[PDB]
Amino acid sequence: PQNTFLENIVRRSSESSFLLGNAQIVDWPVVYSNDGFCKLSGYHRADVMQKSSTCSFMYGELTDKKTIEKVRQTFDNYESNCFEVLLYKKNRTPVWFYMQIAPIRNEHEKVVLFLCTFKDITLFKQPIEDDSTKGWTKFARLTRALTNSRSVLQQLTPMNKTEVVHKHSRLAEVLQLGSDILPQYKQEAPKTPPHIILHYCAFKTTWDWVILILTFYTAIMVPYNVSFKTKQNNIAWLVLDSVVDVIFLVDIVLNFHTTFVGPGGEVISDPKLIRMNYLKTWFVIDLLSCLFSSLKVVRLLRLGRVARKLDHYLEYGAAVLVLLVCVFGLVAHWLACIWYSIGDYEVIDEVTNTIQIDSWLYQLALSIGTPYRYNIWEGGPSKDSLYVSSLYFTMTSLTTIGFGNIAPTTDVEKMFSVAMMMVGSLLYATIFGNVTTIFQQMYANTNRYHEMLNNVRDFLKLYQVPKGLSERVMDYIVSTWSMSKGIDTEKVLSICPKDMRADICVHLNRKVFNEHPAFRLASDGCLRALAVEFQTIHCAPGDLIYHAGESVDALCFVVSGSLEVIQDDEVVAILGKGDVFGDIFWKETTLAHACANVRALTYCDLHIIKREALLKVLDFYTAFANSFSRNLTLTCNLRKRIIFRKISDVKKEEEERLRQ
Amino acid sequence: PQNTFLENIVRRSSESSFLLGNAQIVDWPVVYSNDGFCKLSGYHRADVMQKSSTCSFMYGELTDKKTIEKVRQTFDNYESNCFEVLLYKKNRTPVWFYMQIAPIRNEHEKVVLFLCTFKDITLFKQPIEDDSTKGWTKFARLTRALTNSRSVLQQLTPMNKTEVVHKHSRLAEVLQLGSDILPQYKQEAPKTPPHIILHYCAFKTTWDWVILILTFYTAIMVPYNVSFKTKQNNIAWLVLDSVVDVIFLVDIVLNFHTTFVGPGGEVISDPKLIRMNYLKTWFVIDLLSCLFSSLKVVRLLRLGRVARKLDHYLEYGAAVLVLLVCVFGLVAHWLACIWYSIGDYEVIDEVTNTIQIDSWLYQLALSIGTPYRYNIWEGGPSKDSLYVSSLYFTMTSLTTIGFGNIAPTTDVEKMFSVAMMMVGSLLYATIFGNVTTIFQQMYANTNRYHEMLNNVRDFLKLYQVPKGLSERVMDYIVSTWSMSKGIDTEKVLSICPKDMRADICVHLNRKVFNEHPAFRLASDGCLRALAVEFQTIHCAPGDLIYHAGESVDALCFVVSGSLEVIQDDEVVAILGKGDVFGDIFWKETTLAHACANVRALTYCDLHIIKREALLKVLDFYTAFANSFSRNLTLTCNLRKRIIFRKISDVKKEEEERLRQ
């Protein structure tokens, strides 16, 4: 919902007369005399500063030939004019107009709320008032006493060695208007400049997960290529690397054409702000990562890219667990690469020509079976075996299992082992604490329900409650949790605003408003004033709703279940669905008591509205009380005692009368 | 804020007359006739015991030549006098004065609140009242009927074989006054005696972290030097050891000149208390640690020093994690030193001359490659390899990984291993439980926000709320958490005092007081009486604030957003920023209803003040109500219906009138 005349005009616009009009009986809204009419050009609000689309009441002079129907007619023409009518101004002069015209129709197809951006002048023609005629008071001071459209572009004398150039905001401003103004009626939603995409569309979503997948691929492939020195025979990987690099470069380019949330939580949409913000925030790192061994470790920063985007991901529970297991695998892989690099460095001393029998590649070669042979040193474990052994060792070390068939024995490997031990201990602790908490986050609610059940059971056992009452209490608790699964309405309604709470309650009833032929002629005033008062109740079988222990003070509505109005051990009516039972409240102003013993056959759901909160609303909306009185029929009028009389035992009464 | 005359005079001062005065119209404050004028020397409060800087009203005698303007003039002289005026005393005699004078001016430069420490006498000259003239009643009993400055130093007869020595509190007490009295006006803050430093300055902070760093250094270096027997060739370490020792000794000396918080939570500042407290509390341990193998284990007590200072550190989250990892490293290092000591003890039996093939140094030597050789037993693993192996083993044992390439096999090592196992299990459990809790302490708040979101989402899903209402509720919750991130104002305002709460609220408004030209002529009374009543509201787009469902009873102020006052499907005014809309309350004393349908264009923030809590304050401060009435202009007076009339359809009404 937007009338498209205020939201984004306080930044770029200038002096204008954004006439709206409403077009039923006489004048309504001219509204925006914005950007310069503060307290120095016209009236203030409640005047033609804010209404009377065709302006008046600021006249202050006589009705001359030009001062009647020239632009006063133009205001409701909407199309085009160039004449000169009078509208009073601070200059104390017979004001006439130089202006520009611009139409636009509607979205609702009503020929209302046009654009009509106007300028108005007083100076450029003539002052001829004799209020001050002391030489240069109105014949040369005219260039001083105007505070109008002149003060937008050309705030100097109208001559100023210039004839038509200074006519750009009074005579030739129509080229700066039209499509440069917001529309006359549209729909309010986050809108973007041309060739700009929002950050929550179906395009940026797919690219976010695509970039995440490619980053997860690079974080795996780059350390492997750096440590386990590979080859280039397969040109397939050589071209997929270029494909991924160019995809990331295209994403860097496309990041200029997106939207980001700023201070306060609103979608910012303007090319210059987007560009400079993205630049200053991430362009250095993005360029460094996009474009010899150290170059790949620099290239790894696309993982920090996903780290910055992490706020978009997560918060969904299962995704957190998947991310945690993925990062555990990633750190295991990185430690495997470092471990293999160390193991390859240690074997084969280059000072002499000998193989160091300590390392871990020599022990692995001895255990597997394939040894190192000299012919300069070639022949040993295959690359797949080396990688799988490195991963297996680092997984033994991270998971704190520890086997010992692959263990550090040299000097460098022990230092690296203690470093890995500290790092892995920290990561293990944090990661699996988070995993356990995430897994317990829902069994927390389940255990809340179980704790409620256990507390009720313990209370029933401790005080030695009989079997029937205990089983009824258990059944009621089970049913109430079944239809109210953990969710509590009071808090959710408390954290919402007043109007939104009223709307939520109105939709919560949904079966006593559009189902009962009484609440029909109420659009949005009575429905949102009564629903805040209706309260839903659930009643167990055998419960006495309005037995002879309470007075009738609530117009109860039945929406699900069945009730029988027991009167002296027997039933006079059996209420079903959509049958209101209760006392008349709006036309007696009295009180009575329970004329019956209303029970509940099955589990029932009723909608109580209190008496004092019922007739007040219909008294406020007097047009609704008439329909309410004329369209409500009480199925069981629990106000008057009925003449209740039972079939087949006055027979023996008459028999005894004839006998006695 | 301190007038410097009560805070610290009840411990050292004596009889005095600490005259203040206030100097505008007539008398005000002489105030402190402290330390002896309880109920036995003069009047009580509300008299020249507390006001009338120039004293009077305690006369009780006739106006003699000396009894008019001698010291009664001295009180406002402030400079010097030695004369004798009358001021009535319990002696029932024509009192005259022996006194001492002392001036001091101000801090605010006003020549007010001088020092004027006076003494007053009655005895030393003469009693000549004939009330009791029964011999030794006023000529010899004079030495009994005085209860004044005599009762401070020389409480005996004025003769007492002494002439001028007994004149030390009536004639020669000026040398015990002056700079020995607190000032006349200063600023209140924790102050220290000369050559005393506070415990939260920028000096003791740097020394606290310096001592912490040096203690962390010693706790690492001392066990290493004790176990791995080092040398002295590098004189560099030999001089850094002396430098650190002398630094710690200087710190022990400097601890005499610091301040410590005592009982109740106040900064104690007095050399004797500081000295004796520090001595009795820590001097034994500090001296023992400051100043052959056992001497270093004693020297290790500087770690207990940091343990005592620990309260200063910690409580910052990240510092807790850093401290925990540091102590884990420290215990690993200590266990490494003990393990190497055991391993060095076991190898090479001294009864025979043989090497024990069990230990762990022999197995390590066999695995590494360098064996033990005999020529008495020399040659083996280097010192760096020995230390790194010891650390690696103890880190395998503490982190509960366990590899087995270095494992206990002798008799002593198994007992030490089980002891280390129990100790490491305890330390592991406590340390990493604390680490996990500290890490979860902030994701607790994040998970509270996520739980609120999940509860709202579940409530919306369960009851099948339509799309528009659900999305509006989600947006409102997101915005409210965005600008109110976890922080709840009610609790923080509850735990604060009343005046501080009022000040916090006054600063919380900050945009309806110093921005609106109405709340200008109110210094501190009306602002702190109205801000406790103002409540801020946030309204979502499309919300109806004061539609035709409520009566106008609140002078709402707009500080951010925009509102349009819809009247019969169309708008008569569009409120902006700093535009108050509401009913007049202080000059009609009536009630009306919503003459409009005020909506909210964008997200808005308003400042409601209730009617009954508004005019009461301005009624209390009658000088403020005049300015409030004369300086408030309602932008949208939602009290009176305006004559609203719409432009361009009476045209067809007149057309039909001419047609029908």
Ligand SMILES: [K+]
């Ligand atoms: K093992």
Ligand SMILES: [K+]
């Ligand atoms: K283990």
Ligand SMILES: [K+]
């Ligand atoms: K083993």
